[PDB]
Design a protein around this ligand. Structure first.
Ligand code: HEM
Ligand code: HEM
Ligand SMILES: CN[C@H](C)Cc1cc(C#N)cc(OCc2ccc3c(C)cc(N)nc3c2)c1
Ligand SMILES: CN[C@H](C)Cc1cc(C#N)cc(OCc2ccc3c(C)cc(N)nc3c2)c1
Ligand SMILES: C[C@H](O)[C@H](O)[C@H]1CNc2nc(N)[nH]c(=O)c2N1
Ligand SMILES: C[C@H](O)[C@H](O)[C@H]1CNc2nc(N)[nH]c(=O)c2N1
Ligand SMILES: [Zn+2]
Lengths: 410, 413
């Protein structure tokens, strides 16, 4: 149960971790087996109050009021409410503190230097899918801000008995449709083919193009989900072009400005918010390496290398690698030219090392998942590659949850 | 622990089941509440300690040759037991030594090249007694492994540790490496990673040429005596000058690298026995030279100079001038080796072979320990098939282990 050191082998800087001692949730590893590359490893009144007490305790600790009259009174209030209702409600201040800290605690996010600038929208009074649609339209408009993107989260009512869950069925608020072709191939985004069929089956008339914006599929109070169209003037998009290669715009690529993840679960003090879409801005490689060049995604490396007239017969010509750099140059140039906020992996990994040093200084550690933090291209020439990291699970947190079409009954 | 563990590939959705993890021996550094997978590294054995370790190994060996529980198995068990009982150690048979060495490689979770494990040439040097003899064994290893550019994997194994005061060591970190010299003005000539060992060699009497690519001498310790200096015959050191298929000016940078990667500071552990000197070698993956040796800030650090000759905009990072230069460098390295007919493999081919190897191991062995943090290549990660592969890491014996630098522990005579 020591203090653990972490070393940077580029700078020989050595930080000391004490924060991991405060961890409670399990990571998935054992003393004999490490599972750090597994993507997803492995209530009632009775267990609810201790989880509530822990969270209330660290909140009043954070505002230098630990043991105050207010603190004592809030604990008493919460006990009486779990007693008589089998749950409790967060104060507005607590809700904001809780959401900011779930971002702060997200081991896999390289963008956490921004964690305390998070705009929190409280949607806990929502009762229908129409009201969900309204709240989501306001979120998108605020976060987009005509290209000057601002970080935000919208929080719908918490889970009760499990039969009345609020869910956003989309995995992101803005995504493109994908279509299984008669000839076996895929049109549009292949990552979204299943969701697209669910939408068509629900009455959505598909334009059947490469970049059709999906409709929102929204579930309130455990009812059947309902389809809504996002007003097109709210969806900001960027035509992808290349600063040197004139032919690149002829490829006809484009992407949306706003990354907004909508299928995770937010956990604060034992309460579960099953619908809580949150958004920031992109790191270029999320679009240019993964979205465009994954074999199971848009997979455009082949066409681009052809236009570059590269030798594609042998792998050792690194034609895949040259074409990759060029696509990511194009993505960054396009966003920047249209004044839409974006960060490159060099600048982002720099910021994160600075953030780590901040957190060790003021908090005594920073949980970090090397497997996800290091970018999907040019790893070792970014500073995070050579940085030792410790990974552990703090709460409040964001968690994975099951796709609602596996659980729902109509 | 559960009997079955599942890993998924997120690109192909293929799912594999691991049972081999039940045979795991030592700790990893992780716990239920913390993971240390990105940490680089997370007085002899007694009789009572050594008995069960030898038995475990002997059982493993006779099981592998399909003679488990045989008369010969039970006699070997008895022979080893008496030997430990009356000498506090024992000696491996030649067959057992060869099996152990091959399986230390097979068990190396950080090696992407393990599809080759069963083809290792093993050189028994347990009769060695002096540093001159160590030099002779090491020269023969280098000549055999190099094979005029058609490289062949090999290990040479010197006598095991006894009381700890008589260790055999190769003080070099690799058999072939270039010198580094710290200048009075703070700059470095040669390879910065080797400044310390170079200073030690100079102190022991080496007269340095003081250039950019000077092959270091061997510093060899036998039977616990003070180490001795030997120059490797230059004709045994195969090198490759680096050029580019398209940029004529790339040859003007004056770069070269050596053909044979041969790690010499690790310890080999078999059945509880410790071989502190065990140099082993294979051939290079391009990125090892092209990305790390050349482009690490604390190494030769040539990105800026290449970027200038490519005439890239270097004032903004978001122009990805670094990423562009890195690719061309790695292109030139692969091109030069192939042109000179020296064995080398690109990271695409290597990772693809490793996925095939890993699936075959899951099927015939019930698993394959692997360290994602080291297996995934230092450039273009997500467009290689290992990026999307879930892996399990655990430690099997026989194994290769880290050990302290010898100058920190050695008692000078
Ligand atoms: C502000 C700019 C941000 C940037 C540049 C950024 C960057 C990233 C990247 C690149 C990833 C890995 C994504 C992937 O490879 O799939 C990630 C993960 C993640 N982000 Fe951030 N992010 C930002 C903001 C936020 C915000 C505002 C939140 C929440 C309020 C957040 C929560 C998370 C979580 C929970 C993960 C891990 C998801 C998982 O475990 O699957 N991020 N981030
Ligand atoms: C035959 C071609 C081989 C290739 C292409 C290969 C490839 C690699 C690479 C790229 C690494 C990571 C290097 C680094 O980043 O420092 C590595 C690590 C390693 N290899 Fe291999 N290897 C080969 C042969 C061998 C052989 C013959 C042995 C032993 C008999 C071996 C044992 C190891 C060990 C023990 C490590 C990890 C060392 C550590 O933990 O620091 N390899 N290999
Ligand atoms: C195929 N690989 C899958 C998509 C991995 C993944 C799964 C889930 C979920 N559920 C959620 C994920 O979210 C990543 C994420 C989350 C939030 C982000 C924000 C707020 C900004 C940003 N630039 N990227 C993000 C990236 C990722
Ligand atoms: C700065 N990072 C350091 C050098 C990591 C490292 C340490 C040690 C040791 N001791 C040994 C190491 O060996 C890596 C290795 C070992 C064997 C190899 C073989 C046999 C072939 C090959 N192509 N690469 C290897 C690479 C690496
Ligand atoms: C901090 C991190 O664990 C360290 O830099 C590792 C990462 N992965 C690596 N992977 C390989 N193949 N070789 C290395 O030297 C390293 N260094
Ligand atoms: C198997 C492996 O864990 C999986 O492919 C991970 C690897 N690292 C990643 N890192 C990021 N940032 N995003 C990812 O989706 C993944 N995928
Ligand atoms: Zn682990």
């Amino acid at each position: 149960p020591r203090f653990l050191k972490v070393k940077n082998w580029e700078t020989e800087v050595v930080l000391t971790d004490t924060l991991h001692l405060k961890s409670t949730l399990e990571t998935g590893c054992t003393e004999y087996i490490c599972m750090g590359s597994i993507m997803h490893p492995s209530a009632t009144k009775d267990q609810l109050f201790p989880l509530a007490k822990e969270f209330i305790d660290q909140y009043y600790s954070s505002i230098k009021r630990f043991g105050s009259k207010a603190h004592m009174e809030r604990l008493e209030e919460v006990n009486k409410e779990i007693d008589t209702t089998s749950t409790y409600q967060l104060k507005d201040t607590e809700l904001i503190y809780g959401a900011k800290h779930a971002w702060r605690n997200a081991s896999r996010c390289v963008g956490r230097i921004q964690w305390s600038k998070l705009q929190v929208f409280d949607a806990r009074d929502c009762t229908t899918a129409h009201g969900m649609f309204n709240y989501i339209c306001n979120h998108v408009k605020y976060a987009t801000n005509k290209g000057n993107l601002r970080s935000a989260i919208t929080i719908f009512p918490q889970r009760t008995d499990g039969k009345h869950d609020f869910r956003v069925w989309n995995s992101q608020l803005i995504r493109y449709a994908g279509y299984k072709q008669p000839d076996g191939s895929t049109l549009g985004d292949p990552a979204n083919v299943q969701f697209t069929e669910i939408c068509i089956q629900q009455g959505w008339k598909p334009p059947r193009g490469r970049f059709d914006v999906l409709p929102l599929l929204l579930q309130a109070n455990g009812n059947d989900p309902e389809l809504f169209q996002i007003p097109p003037e709210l969806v900001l998009e960027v035509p992808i072009r290349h600063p040197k290669f004139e032919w690149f715009k002829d490829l006809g690529l484009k992407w949306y400005g706003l990354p907004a993840v909508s299928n995770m679960l937010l956990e604060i003090g034992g309460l579960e918010f099953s619908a809580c879409p949150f958004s920031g801005w992109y790191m270029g490689t999320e679009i240019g390496v993964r979205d465009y060049c994954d074999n199971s995604r848009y997979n455009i490396l082949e066409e681009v290398a052809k236009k570059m007239n590269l030798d594609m017969r042998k792998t050792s010509s690194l034609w895949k690698d040259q074409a990759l750099v060029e696509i990511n140059i194009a993505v960054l140039y396009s966003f920047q030219s249209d004044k839409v906020t974006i960060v490159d992996h060099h600048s982002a990994t720099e910021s994160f090392i600075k953030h780590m040093e901040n957190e060790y200084r003021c908090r005594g550690g920073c949980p970090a998942d090397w497997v996800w933090i290091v970018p999907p291209m040019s790893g070792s020439i970014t500073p995070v590659f050579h940085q030792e990291m410790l990974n552990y699970r703090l709460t409040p947190s964001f968690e994975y949850q099951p796709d609602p079409w596996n659980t729902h009954v109509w």
